[PDB]
Amino acid sequence: SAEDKAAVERSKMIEKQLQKDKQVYRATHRLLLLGADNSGKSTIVKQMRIYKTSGIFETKFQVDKVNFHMFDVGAQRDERRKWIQCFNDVTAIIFVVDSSDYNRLQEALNDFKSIWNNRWLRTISVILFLNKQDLLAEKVLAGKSKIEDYFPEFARYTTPEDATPEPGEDPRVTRAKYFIRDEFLRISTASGDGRHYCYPHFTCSVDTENARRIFNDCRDIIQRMHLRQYELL
Amino acid sequence: DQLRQEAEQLKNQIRDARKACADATLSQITNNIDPVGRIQMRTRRTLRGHLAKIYAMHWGTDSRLLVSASQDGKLIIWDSYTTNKVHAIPLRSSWVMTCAYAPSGNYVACGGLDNICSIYNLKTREGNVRVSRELAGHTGYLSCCRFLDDNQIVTSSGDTTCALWDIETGQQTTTFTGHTGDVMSLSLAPDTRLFVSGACDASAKLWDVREGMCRQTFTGHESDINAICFFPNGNAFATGSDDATCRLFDLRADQELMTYSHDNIICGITSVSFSKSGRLLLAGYDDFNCNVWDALKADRAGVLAGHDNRVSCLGVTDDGMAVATGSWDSFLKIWNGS
Amino acid sequence: GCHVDSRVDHLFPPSLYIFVIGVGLPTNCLALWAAYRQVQQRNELGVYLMNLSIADLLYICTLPLWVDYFLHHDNWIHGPGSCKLFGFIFYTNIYISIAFLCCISVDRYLAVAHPLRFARLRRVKTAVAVSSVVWATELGANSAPLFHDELFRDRYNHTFCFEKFPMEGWVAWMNLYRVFVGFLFPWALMLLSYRGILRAVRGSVSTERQEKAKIKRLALSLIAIVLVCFAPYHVLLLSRSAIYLGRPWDCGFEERVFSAYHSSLAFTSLNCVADPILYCLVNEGARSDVAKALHNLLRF
Amino acid sequence: QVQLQESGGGLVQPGGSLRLSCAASGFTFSNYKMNWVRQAPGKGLEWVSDISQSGASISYTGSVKGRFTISRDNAKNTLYLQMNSLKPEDTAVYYCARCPAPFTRDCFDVTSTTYAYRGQGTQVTV
Amino acid sequence: IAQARKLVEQLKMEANIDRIKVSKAAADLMAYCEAHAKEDPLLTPVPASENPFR
Ligand SMILES: CC(C)CCC[C@@H](C)[C@H]1CC[C@H]2[C@@H]3CC=C4C[C@@H](O)CC[C@]4(C)[C@H]3CC[C@]12C
Ligand SMILES: CC(C)CCC[C@@H](C)[C@H]1CC[C@H]2[C@@H]3CC=C4C[C@@H](O)CC[C@]4(C)[C@H]3CC[C@]12C
Ligand SMILES: CC(=O)OC[C@@H](O)COP(=O)(O)OCC[N+](C)(C)C
Ligand SMILES: CC(=O)OC[C@@H](O)COP(=O)(O)OCC[N+](C)(C)C
């Protein structure tokens, strides 16, 4: 029985190590960063590292002593209908879209639609980052490009009372911003059934408060998950 | 445009030949077969050491030790008979899609989104698992890196390309770029001279390790193919696809010979395996339960309904003594009959 | 012991006890099954829930003998050895249900209003440390009755159990400790924790008004049912203790609070039927689990 | 097996009206949500519009809204797209595509550089 | 351009291979299934005395 006893002892040591790994694993949250080529997700990754064909890059950061793992897809082909299914238990998905470019905005909308309608992403809240707001404001002020041609529904749009324009912001820029935000939120709410929510944020590539917004979104998501888990919701 | 017309003519010729062969259906040569009957496989042992969704496993040659890969970033080698955990290898990348056990049991391979297959040695004189080799060069996510011997590993990646690697030198010995979509999984024939793979284009291809060229192609499926396994004799293989229909293909026939589907079944197939005869095609489904079908009569033989989430990985021991299922509920389950 | 009054002490407590035994054993068994399921899914709450049901089932499994007691107008016919066992498990289970109810509130508040902070205090193994330090502390701090005589006999054919209306000092300080430490402090803890939960909910951007108000109603019902069930009896106990410490009409008062006391200690048992409903049946998930259990039972 | 063939096209003056057909073989036309794509000179693949299994849900890109329409014929295994008020800036190779999996509401890679479930396409010129 | 030439070649390689009759490749996986059917623990279960997973 000496060999058997040694086997059980080794299993016990492995179980203790796995329990340590378990405590570590529940002590950190996983986030999936997604965006298009135009979207400045790389800039966000650089400006959030302030706390070879690799394929996937990992960013370790910490907010309020809470550890966060962000995974960015790298040297992988355009096809994404299969590996995305590996991110079915991530805490949240941070989607970065370029609002300045009216062209390819429909592509971002379609990508968001696909992500929302994906079967394995129905229980994961998506954090929406409308990036490159300064470029959008400059383009709107210039007036060379018109949103009506790309989005004929923008003509009838009016800024809702819920909108909170920033100080010294032209009505046109805020109108366009909230029009695009409502375009995203329509898709968000079309399929939402209480297990899926979106967090629309107006962000810029040079922003030091994106981590705070991500932490708040994760806090809200885990609060809802606990509410459901602890027989309250 | 001339090349396109020539390709169309060649495809028409292929179709005409394959039709010329097809006189009778497997179902007819098999109508005179006694049905297997209900299979009442029950869970004998349960493994709950894994943290997150299990994504890959491989039975060893001894049918006593099994390897399981879990996205927590852990490759656990379990002793099935006594439930003891033989080994626990932490992984550099938490995302792992494939794992394989060497025929001699000395090397264990793993791979995932890192586009690298890492091989660890279990017979080190120090008794501690270490990174024996790291193989890189693929531009897509590795979906299946399987073993041929101790110094040669075949792998499938998400760059529509498969590779054969010498593990001592660490370079790509052979490359296969005939597919047009993500290769999802491959199976080695027992002869260790041919291997069949499936891609995300409803297309399966047969490849020769020594030569390095495509041999045969089959496009009987509708949606993407996720699972592939070689029938014991090595002259046939089963395929599962997202369209919720499995199929059986034969190399010599060069066309599909069976389709397993049902109206109630709406989910796809993630993993497939055969039994030691070939009379029990076991298949995972996204409906959170595995189904075992009679490969000869296409009659549903049994259902393993114990699982809380999607079943990802399916394995059968070399002697067919037990069936091991790993799902996204971080539990592996060993099923055996009575 | 001054003569007592039993006009309504002959029917009402027996009837309420029978009602609880009828609608309490089934429902508490269902709640226990659902709690074991929740712990099976590695949920700390179930650990607190399971124990609670185990307490209630240990209170409902002693009420038959007290129905026997009351039906014979207090005449115990089982000897002191049974009044030392079935009396302890019948007075201490209310204060163990109080304690285990408070653990659920603390757990819910930590989870909701501190989602990312206290993982260590939210394991199924820090719930078998608290669930045991509660079962030990309640059964030790309420153990004084076991050291004293239970079976007291007056002159009006009335035998007794755990009760001597010409009360004594040990009973006095025990009642005071039970009223303040036993009942009011856990209740205020529960109220504070549910208030924290509700203020956390109010800040949720992903929760609709309907869900927020549903949580509000559930929490208010959970807080108020405990009070409705227990305060009528704790107030009477406090009044008895004050009357005995000051002794204004040490006998007179006792004459007119026999039936009131015995009918207020029976309302307390109503907390055994409200707990399995509010914590298991009200929720849709636990109700679906109960229905799956019933489906399995129907085909066994 | 799987094959999507597009029919129609040819030169048209600005403001004309055409109809493009899409025949599919190999799969079940009904279970698959299908779309229309177009690659324009100097530009990439663009998502035109979609139609679902039932056909009661539609979506268009605003650039072709009020002008083009999408219809499905499950019995004919055929998709149809009407072109009206055609503009010169709507000249491209139009492709017929289907969503990767059946009984599925999400279609991720319909607009990728290479897609194993898209037809050859037809050159519509204006 | 040259991706069409390669596909044409890979379609000739696949069209010049030898093939056999279907009923002759269908009644062979049958004989393989029949000749290895008394040694399958999951189709014909082994008793609970030689079963390692008792
Ligand atoms: C270990 C996991 C499942 C967590 C749950 C543990 C539960 C089932 C355990 C822990 C504490 C235990 C209780 C401790 C003491 C008592 C008092 C005794 O007079 C009756 C049994 C009872 C009430 C026990 C029942 C079983 C119990 C409730
Ligand atoms: C035990 C017996 C005798 C009494 C039972 C009293 C019950 C029915 C009472 C006591 C407290 C009450 C709750 C108190 C306050 C609220 C909030 C209000 O916005 C909706 C109703 C709701 C949620 C009540 C529902 C009914 C309730 C739970
Ligand atoms: C972190 C957690 O979930 O644990 C909470 C638990 O500690 C609360 O229980 P207490 O308030 O200590 O019980 C007091 C009961 N009383 C006074 C003795 C009758
Ligand atoms: C058991 C013990 O030792 O005491 C812990 C006690 O702090 C738990 O009660 P809380 O839920 O934290 O009350 C805070 C609620 N708030 C902030 C007023 C809204």
PDB file of N, CA and C in Angstrom, chain C residues 105-170:
ATOM      1  N   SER C 105     -28.765  37.667   5.417  1.00  0.00           N
ATOM      2  CA  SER C 105     -28.770  39.097   5.120  1.00  0.00           C
ATOM      3  C   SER C 105     -27.352  39.636   4.979  1.00  0.00           C
ATOM      4  N   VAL C 106     -26.455  39.250   5.891  1.00  0.00           N
ATOM      5  CA  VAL C 106     -25.067  39.694   5.792  1.00  0.00           C
ATOM      6  C   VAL C 106     -24.445  39.196   4.495  1.00  0.00           C
ATOM      7  N   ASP C 107     -24.693  37.932   4.147  1.00  0.00           N
ATOM      8  CA  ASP C 107     -24.144  37.383   2.911  1.00  0.00           C
ATOM      9  C   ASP C 107     -24.651  38.151   1.699  1.00  0.00           C
ATOM     10  N   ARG C 108     -25.961  38.401   1.645  1.00  0.00           N
ATOM     11  CA  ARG C 108     -26.530  39.114   0.508  1.00  0.00           C
ATOM     12  C   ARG C 108     -25.973  40.526   0.412  1.00  0.00           C
ATOM     13  N   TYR C 109     -25.822  41.206   1.551  1.00  0.00           N
ATOM     14  CA  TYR C 109     -25.309  42.570   1.524  1.00  0.00           C
ATOM     15  C   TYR C 109     -23.849  42.598   1.088  1.00  0.00           C
ATOM     16  N   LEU C 110     -23.032  41.673   1.600  1.00  0.00           N
ATOM     17  CA  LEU C 110     -21.642  41.597   1.160  1.00  0.00           C
ATOM     18  C   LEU C 110     -21.560  41.324  -0.336  1.00  0.00           C
ATOM     19  N   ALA C 111     -22.404  40.422  -0.842  1.00  0.00           N
ATOM     20  CA  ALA C 111     -22.356  40.080  -2.259  1.00  0.00           C
ATOM     21  C   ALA C 111     -22.794  41.253  -3.130  1.00  0.00           C
ATOM     22  N   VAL C 112     -23.900  41.905  -2.767  1.00  0.00           N
ATOM     23  CA  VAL C 112     -24.480  42.930  -3.633  1.00  0.00           C
ATOM     24  C   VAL C 112     -23.690  44.230  -3.529  1.00  0.00           C
ATOM     25  N   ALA C 113     -23.524  44.742  -2.311  1.00  0.00           N
ATOM     26  CA  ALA C 113     -22.892  46.037  -2.094  1.00  0.00           C
ATOM     27  C   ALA C 113     -21.374  45.954  -1.994  1.00  0.00           C
ATOM     28  N   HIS C 114     -20.797  44.754  -2.064  1.00  0.00           N
ATOM     29  CA  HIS C 114     -19.343  44.577  -2.103  1.00  0.00           C
ATOM     30  C   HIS C 114     -19.020  43.412  -3.029  1.00  0.00           C
ATOM     31  N   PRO C 115     -19.363  43.537  -4.314  1.00  0.00           N
ATOM     32  CA  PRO C 115     -19.227  42.385  -5.223  1.00  0.00           C
ATOM     33  C   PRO C 115     -17.807  41.866  -5.367  1.00  0.00           C
ATOM     34  N   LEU C 116     -16.806  42.746  -5.342  1.00  0.00           N
ATOM     35  CA  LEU C 116     -15.443  42.376  -5.698  1.00  0.00           C
ATOM     36  C   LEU C 116     -14.500  42.290  -4.506  1.00  0.00           C
ATOM     37  N   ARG C 117     -14.976  42.547  -3.287  1.00  0.00           N
ATOM     38  CA  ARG C 117     -14.090  42.682  -2.134  1.00  0.00           C
ATOM     39  C   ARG C 117     -13.941  41.388  -1.339  1.00  0.00           C
ATOM     40  N   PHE C 118     -15.038  40.876  -0.781  1.00  0.00           N
ATOM     41  CA  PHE C 118     -14.975  39.807   0.217  1.00  0.00           C
ATOM     42  C   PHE C 118     -15.288  38.466  -0.438  1.00  0.00           C
ATOM     43  N   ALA C 119     -14.299  37.936  -1.160  1.00  0.00           N
ATOM     44  CA  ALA C 119     -14.404  36.572  -1.665  1.00  0.00           C
ATOM     45  C   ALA C 119     -14.148  35.551  -0.563  1.00  0.00           C
ATOM     46  N   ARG C 120     -13.169  35.821   0.306  1.00  0.00           N
ATOM     47  CA  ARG C 120     -12.792  34.848   1.327  1.00  0.00           C
ATOM     48  C   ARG C 120     -13.958  34.546   2.258  1.00  0.00           C
ATOM     49  N   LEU C 121     -14.711  35.572   2.645  1.00  0.00           N
ATOM     50  CA  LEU C 121     -15.863  35.405   3.519  1.00  0.00           C
ATOM     51  C   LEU C 121     -17.090  34.867   2.785  1.00  0.00           C
ATOM     52  N   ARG C 122     -16.952  34.436   1.532  1.00  0.00           N
ATOM     53  CA  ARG C 122     -18.092  34.047   0.707  1.00  0.00           C
ATOM     54  C   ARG C 122     -17.847  32.699   0.040  1.00  0.00           C
ATOM     55  N   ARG C 123     -17.228  31.779   0.770  1.00  0.00           N
ATOM     56  CA  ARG C 123     -17.000  30.412   0.328  1.00  0.00           C
ATOM     57  C   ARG C 123     -17.926  29.459   1.074  1.00  0.00           C
ATOM     58  N   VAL C 124     -18.057  28.249   0.534  1.00  0.00           N
ATOM     59  CA  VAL C 124     -18.915  27.226   1.126  1.00  0.00           C
ATOM     60  C   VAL C 124     -18.193  26.598   2.310  1.00  0.00           C
ATOM     61  N   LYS C 125     -16.963  27.048   2.573  1.00  0.00           N
ATOM     62  CA  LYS C 125     -16.192  26.569   3.708  1.00  0.00           C
ATOM     63  C   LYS C 125     -16.075  27.603   4.818  1.00  0.00           C
ATOM     64  N   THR C 126     -16.483  28.862   4.598  1.00  0.00           N
ATOM     65  CA  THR C 126     -16.587  29.889   5.655  1.00  0.00           C
ATOM     66  C   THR C 126     -18.020  29.974   6.011  1.00  0.00           C
ATOM     67  N   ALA C 127     -18.829  29.082   5.503  1.00  0.00           N
ATOM     68  CA  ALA C 127     -20.249  28.999   5.803  1.00  0.00           C
ATOM     69  C   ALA C 127     -20.467  27.740   6.607  1.00  0.00           C
ATOM     70  N   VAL C 128     -19.467  26.864   6.717  1.00  0.00           N
ATOM     71  CA  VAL C 128     -19.576  25.654   7.569  1.00  0.00           C
ATOM     72  C   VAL C 128     -18.704  25.947   8.772  1.00  0.00           C
ATOM     73  N   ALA C 129     -18.211  27.142   8.905  1.00  0.00           N
ATOM     74  CA  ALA C 129     -17.501  27.622  10.087  1.00  0.00           C
ATOM     75  C   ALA C 129     -18.476  28.480  10.865  1.00  0.00           C
ATOM     76  N   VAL C 130     -19.244  29.354  10.210  1.00  0.00           N
ATOM     77  CA  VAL C 130     -20.275  30.182  10.826  1.00  0.00           C
ATOM     78  C   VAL C 130     -21.520  29.368  11.181  1.00  0.00           C
ATOM     79  N   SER C 131     -21.961  28.478  10.292  1.00  0.00           N
ATOM     80  CA  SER C 131     -23.115  27.629  10.555  1.00  0.00           C
ATOM     81  C   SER C 131     -22.910  26.703  11.746  1.00  0.00           C
ATOM     82  N   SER C 132     -21.664  26.420  12.116  1.00  0.00           N
ATOM     83  CA  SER C 132     -21.358  25.622  13.293  1.00  0.00           C
ATOM     84  C   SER C 132     -21.114  26.457  14.538  1.00  0.00           C
ATOM     85  N   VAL C 133     -20.425  27.597  14.415  1.00  0.00           N
ATOM     86  CA  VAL C 133     -20.260  28.516  15.539  1.00  0.00           C
ATOM     87  C   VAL C 133     -21.574  29.158  15.948  1.00  0.00           C
ATOM     88  N   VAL C 134     -22.608  29.072  15.111  1.00  0.00           N
ATOM     89  CA  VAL C 134     -23.940  29.536  15.490  1.00  0.00           C
ATOM     90  C   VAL C 134     -24.682  28.416  16.208  1.00  0.00           C
ATOM     91  N   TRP C 135     -24.646  27.206  15.644  1.00  0.00           N
ATOM     92  CA  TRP C 135     -25.306  26.072  16.280  1.00  0.00           C
ATOM     93  C   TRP C 135     -24.718  25.747  17.646  1.00  0.00           C
ATOM     94  N   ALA C 136     -23.427  26.005  17.851  1.00  0.00           N
ATOM     95  CA  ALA C 136     -22.822  25.819  19.164  1.00  0.00           C
ATOM     96  C   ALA C 136     -23.168  26.955  20.119  1.00  0.00           C
ATOM     97  N   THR C 137     -23.079  28.202  19.650  1.00  0.00           N
ATOM     98  CA  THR C 137     -23.316  29.336  20.535  1.00  0.00           C
ATOM     99  C   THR C 137     -24.773  29.414  20.974  1.00  0.00           C
ATOM    100  N   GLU C 138     -25.719  29.101  20.086  1.00  0.00           N
ATOM    101  CA  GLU C 138     -27.125  29.129  20.476  1.00  0.00           C
ATOM    102  C   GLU C 138     -27.447  28.023  21.473  1.00  0.00           C
ATOM    103  N   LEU C 139     -26.939  26.817  21.236  1.00  0.00           N
ATOM    104  CA  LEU C 139     -27.226  25.688  22.109  1.00  0.00           C
ATOM    105  C   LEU C 139     -26.389  25.699  23.382  1.00  0.00           C
ATOM    106  N   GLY C 140     -25.417  26.603  23.497  1.00  0.00           N
ATOM    107  CA  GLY C 140     -24.707  26.781  24.748  1.00  0.00           C
ATOM    108  C   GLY C 140     -25.204  27.965  25.555  1.00  0.00           C
ATOM    109  N   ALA C 141     -25.460  29.091  24.884  1.00  0.00           N
ATOM    110  CA  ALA C 141     -25.910  30.296  25.570  1.00  0.00           C
ATOM    111  C   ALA C 141     -27.367  30.210  26.000  1.00  0.00           C
ATOM    112  N   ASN C 142     -28.124  29.253  25.465  1.00  0.00           N
ATOM    113  CA  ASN C 142     -29.501  29.017  25.876  1.00  0.00           C
ATOM    114  C   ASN C 142     -29.639  27.727  26.675  1.00  0.00           C
ATOM    115  N   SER C 143     -28.547  27.257  27.277  1.00  0.00           N
ATOM    116  CA  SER C 143     -28.526  25.972  27.958  1.00  0.00           C
ATOM    117  C   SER C 143     -28.875  26.059  29.439  1.00  0.00           C
ATOM    118  N   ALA C 144     -29.053  27.260  29.980  1.00  0.00           N
ATOM    119  CA  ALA C 144     -29.395  27.392  31.393  1.00  0.00           C
ATOM    120  C   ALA C 144     -30.597  26.547  31.792  1.00  0.00           C
ATOM    121  N   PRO C 145     -31.674  26.468  31.007  1.00  0.00           N
ATOM    122  CA  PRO C 145     -32.804  25.615  31.408  1.00  0.00           C
ATOM    123  C   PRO C 145     -32.403  24.184  31.715  1.00  0.00           C
ATOM    124  N   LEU C 146     -31.396  23.646  31.024  1.00  0.00           N
ATOM    125  CA  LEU C 146     -31.003  22.261  31.254  1.00  0.00           C
ATOM    126  C   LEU C 146     -30.463  22.037  32.662  1.00  0.00           C
ATOM    127  N   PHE C 147     -30.036  23.094  33.352  1.00  0.00           N
ATOM    128  CA  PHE C 147     -29.502  22.962  34.701  1.00  0.00           C
ATOM    129  C   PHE C 147     -30.563  23.093  35.786  1.00  0.00           C
ATOM    130  N   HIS C 148     -31.797  23.438  35.432  1.00  0.00           N
ATOM    131  CA  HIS C 148     -32.861  23.672  36.398  1.00  0.00           C
ATOM    132  C   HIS C 148     -34.000  22.688  36.172  1.00  0.00           C
ATOM    133  N   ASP C 149     -34.870  22.585  37.173  1.00  0.00           N
ATOM    134  CA  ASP C 149     -36.039  21.724  37.057  1.00  0.00           C
ATOM    135  C   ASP C 149     -36.993  22.282  36.012  1.00  0.00           C
ATOM    136  N   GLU C 150     -37.528  21.397  35.173  1.00  0.00           N
ATOM    137  CA  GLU C 150     -38.513  21.791  34.174  1.00  0.00           C
ATOM    138  C   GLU C 150     -39.934  21.546  34.659  1.00  0.00           C
ATOM    139  N   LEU C 151     -40.183  20.377  35.243  1.00  0.00           N
ATOM    140  CA  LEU C 151     -41.547  19.931  35.517  1.00  0.00           C
ATOM    141  C   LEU C 151     -42.011  20.492  36.854  1.00  0.00           C
ATOM    142  N   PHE C 152     -42.691  21.634  36.797  1.00  0.00           N
ATOM    143  CA  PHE C 152     -43.311  22.258  37.955  1.00  0.00           C
ATOM    144  C   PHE C 152     -44.801  21.928  37.976  1.00  0.00           C
ATOM    145  N   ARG C 153     -45.342  21.789  39.185  1.00  0.00           N
ATOM    146  CA  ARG C 153     -46.720  21.353  39.384  1.00  0.00           C
ATOM    147  C   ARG C 153     -47.426  22.328  40.315  1.00  0.00           C
ATOM    148  N   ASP C 154     -48.522  22.914  39.841  1.00  0.00           N
ATOM    149  CA  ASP C 154     -49.354  23.796  40.643  1.00  0.00           C
ATOM    150  C   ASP C 154     -50.505  22.993  41.262  1.00  0.00           C
ATOM    151  N   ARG C 155     -51.502  23.692  41.803  1.00  0.00           N
ATOM    152  CA  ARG C 155     -52.583  23.073  42.558  1.00  0.00           C
ATOM    153  C   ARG C 155     -53.871  22.902  41.764  1.00  0.00           C
ATOM    154  N   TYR C 156     -53.895  23.281  40.489  1.00  0.00           N
ATOM    155  CA  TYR C 156     -55.112  23.276  39.683  1.00  0.00           C
ATOM    156  C   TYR C 156     -55.037  22.231  38.572  1.00  0.00           C
ATOM    157  N   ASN C 157     -54.443  21.079  38.886  1.00  0.00           N
ATOM    158  CA  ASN C 157     -54.314  19.962  37.955  1.00  0.00           C
ATOM    159  C   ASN C 157     -53.287  20.251  36.865  1.00  0.00           C
ATOM    160  N   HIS C 158     -52.729  21.461  36.845  1.00  0.00           N
ATOM    161  CA  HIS C 158     -51.825  21.856  35.773  1.00  0.00           C
ATOM    162  C   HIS C 158     -50.403  21.417  36.095  1.00  0.00           C
ATOM    163  N   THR C 159     -49.899  20.466  35.322  1.00  0.00           N
ATOM    164  CA  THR C 159     -48.479  20.177  35.249  1.00  0.00           C
ATOM    165  C   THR C 159     -47.862  21.153  34.244  1.00  0.00           C
ATOM    166  N   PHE C 160     -46.531  21.266  34.225  1.00  0.00           N
ATOM    167  CA  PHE C 160     -45.912  22.299  33.399  1.00  0.00           C
ATOM    168  C   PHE C 160     -44.716  21.752  32.631  1.00  0.00           C
ATOM    169  N   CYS C 161     -44.086  22.643  31.868  1.00  0.00           N
ATOM    170  CA  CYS C 161     -42.874  22.315  31.122  1.00  0.00           C
ATOM    171  C   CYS C 161     -42.177  23.614  30.757  1.00  0.00           C
ATOM    172  N   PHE C 162     -40.976  23.828  31.299  1.00  0.00           N
ATOM    173  CA  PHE C 162     -40.188  25.008  30.960  1.00  0.00           C
ATOM    174  C   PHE C 162     -40.869  26.299  31.402  1.00  0.00           C
ATOM    175  N   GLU C 163     -41.980  26.197  32.130  1.00  0.00           N
ATOM    176  CA  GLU C 163     -42.785  27.366  32.465  1.00  0.00           C
ATOM    177  C   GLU C 163     -43.264  27.264  33.904  1.00  0.00           C
ATOM    178  N   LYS C 164     -42.955  28.290  34.695  1.00  0.00           N
ATOM    179  CA  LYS C 164     -43.492  28.460  36.042  1.00  0.00           C
ATOM    180  C   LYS C 164     -43.886  29.924  36.175  1.00  0.00           C
ATOM    181  N   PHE C 165     -45.185  30.207  36.092  1.00  0.00           N
ATOM    182  CA  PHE C 165     -45.623  31.599  36.075  1.00  0.00           C
ATOM    183  C   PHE C 165     -45.176  32.381  37.306  1.00  0.00           C
ATOM    184  N   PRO C 166     -45.153  31.823  38.535  1.00  0.00           N
ATOM    185  CA  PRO C 166     -44.437  32.523  39.610  1.00  0.00           C
ATOM    186  C   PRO C 166     -42.948  32.493  39.320  1.00  0.00           C
ATOM    187  N   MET C 167     -42.587  33.260  38.299  1.00  0.00           N
ATOM    188  CA  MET C 167     -41.301  33.191  37.635  1.00  0.00           C
ATOM    189  C   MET C 167     -40.155  33.486  38.612  1.00  0.00           C
ATOM    190  N   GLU C 168     -38.929  33.211  38.157  1.00  0.00           N
ATOM    191  CA  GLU C 168     -37.724  33.343  38.968  1.00  0.00           C
ATOM    192  C   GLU C 168     -36.665  34.139  38.210  1.00  0.00           C
ATOM    193  N   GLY C 169     -35.616  34.531  38.940  1.00  0.00           N
ATOM    194  CA  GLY C 169     -34.650  35.478  38.395  1.00  0.00           C
ATOM    195  C   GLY C 169     -33.898  34.954  37.185  1.00  0.00           C
ATOM    196  N   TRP C 170     -33.506  33.677  37.214  1.00  0.00           N
ATOM    197  CA  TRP C 170     -32.805  33.107  36.068  1.00  0.00           C
ATOM    198  C   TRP C 170     -33.650  33.248  34.812  1.00  0.00           C
TER     199      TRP C 170
END
